[PDB]
From a paper:
Human estrogen receptor alpha (hERα) belongs to the family of nuclear receptors (NRs). While agonist binding promotes the interaction of the LBD with coregulatory proteins, such as for example the interaction of hERα with the steroid receptor coactivator-2 (SRC-2) protein, binding of antagonists leads to a rearrangement of so-called helix 12 (H12), and this rearrangement precludes any further interaction with coregulators. Here, we show that the application of PROSS server algorithms to the ligand-binding domain of human estrogen receptor alpha (hERα) enabled the development of variant ERPRS* that comprises 24 amino acid substitutions and exhibits multiple improved characteristics. Crystal structures reveal several salient features, i.e. the introduction of a tyrosine corner in a helix-loop-helix segment and the formation of a novel surface salt bridge network possibly explaining the enhanced thermal stability.
Numbering used by the authors:
A (entry chain B): 304 to 548
B (entry chain A): 305 to 461, 464 to 548
C (entry chain D): 686 to 696
D (entry chain C): 687 to 698
Write the structure that this text describes.
Amino acid sequence: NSLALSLTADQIISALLEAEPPILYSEYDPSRPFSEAYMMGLLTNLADRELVHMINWAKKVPGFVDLSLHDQVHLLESAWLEILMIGLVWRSMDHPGKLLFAPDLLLDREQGKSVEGMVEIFDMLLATSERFREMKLQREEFVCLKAIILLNSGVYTFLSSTLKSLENKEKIHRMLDKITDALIWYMAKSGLSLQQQHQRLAQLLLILSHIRHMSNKGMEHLYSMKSKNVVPLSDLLLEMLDAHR
Amino acid sequence: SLALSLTADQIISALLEAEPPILYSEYDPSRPFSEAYMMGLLTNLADRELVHMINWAKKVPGFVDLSLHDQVHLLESAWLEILMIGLVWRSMDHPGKLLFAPDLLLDREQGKSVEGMVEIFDMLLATSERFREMKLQREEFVCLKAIILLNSGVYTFSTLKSLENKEKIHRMLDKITDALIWYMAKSGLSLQQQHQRLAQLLLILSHIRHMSNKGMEHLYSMKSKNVVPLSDLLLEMLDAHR
Amino acid sequence: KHKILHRLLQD
Amino acid sequence: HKILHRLLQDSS
Ligand SMILES: C[C@]12CC[C@@H]3c4ccc(O)cc4CC[C@H]3[C@@H]1CC[C@@H]2O
Ligand SMILES: C[C@]12CC[C@@H]3c4ccc(O)cc4CC[C@H]3[C@@H]1CC[C@@H]2O
Ligand SMILES: [Cl-]
Ligand code: NA
């Protein structure tokens, strides 16, 4: 219907590549006692600054700004931690055994043990990065996956009680199909057979189930750190966390 | 392995034949639904379904070729997702209701008998509606349930044995993808419709994972408040999600 | 309409 | 040992 829904696969991929957010630095100082509070402060301060850039990125995802503001809010509230995590895993592919939170903050699982309950999450994130490495995930595939997360994660909770809200839901589903088309087009241009294309599409989308799982566990962890007053959290982070109850 | 040499038709046939029975609840309609009674009925049903789920898993091609440790871990990861996808499937013919069992068909107002449950009921009802919108077929359902079993626990955390089993799992996941596509092609979908539907179905699995995590938190809350006693099996399946 | 996220998305 | 492990050893 719209200009966004008419884009070709090449146009979609090109737009998503151009929308990529900047890589931000942490505050890490080797002179500081690497305490639970210090590490959590680094991670949440970084997450808060990344969220502002994530909002700008989302507005560049084709069709996203054609949704109502309430729908845009809903999708970002649902997806934000999944998006931070897939970004982290992507940045970490080139560093076996480490998570590149930022160029100055590369942590291994033993460092993750500095925060109660964190090493289990680190291990899941490390396993996902290893999977990306095994698959030789490409940037074009990564950006498609991130756009799929944004559009899919809140879409089952999307209300369609009116003919307009039903229109919005249909637009989201049509755009999800177009991003699938773009992923397949990229794989086909890369020389994969049809069988390999479908197998790889499935492999990539199954990773999204793991990213959802890790986000759920991370949200529980962040709530725990909030409750225990381990770390002060920004107003925006507090609201994003609150949207998950 | 013999499993990795099966054709797409053989894989779908095997999975259809392995389908577990539909069990009845212990519901006594002489009694009203308190929080404790409803939780007792649902966990008693889950416990009895788990035995049949273990039987079913042993029939998923290649599963019994894995180490018992890997079989344990995969089922520990996936069990509630598997119960939930089965529930949604059973409920497709009952808009607005969840067919936990043929004698326990519940609406969201009945879900309110348990604190925190209606939120999960609503997600499951929305998933049933999605299944109806997609006209999900039994062949697609059984492929998705087998994918959950093999995938949910595959990325939890160096030994060579860990790599050998993981490679077997990935090969069989690819075979199930092949089978799903084959079923769609046989059903007349165009090549573009095939990849679009494949993606639509696999994205359901992200929502099923989400619902399982919320359900696992809920079950732990019920346990932690001494609402319902859980079987030793359920206590251990729940504790694996510590 | 009062959420921070709502405000940021209008910029 | 754990119940699930024991049940996975029965046949079928
Ligand atoms: C949310 C947590 C703090 C912020 C962390 C972060 C911070 C920045 C980032 O780019 C990714 C992630 C993913 C892991 C997140 C953590 C998982 C649990 C912890 O509370
Ligand atoms: C796990 C719960 C009890 C068992 C329930 C069940 C029980 C049997 C079944 O076939 C499916 C489900 C899904 C929802 C589950 C519930 C979600 C929260 C509650 O604690
Ligand atoms: Cl910055
Ligand atoms: Na900044």
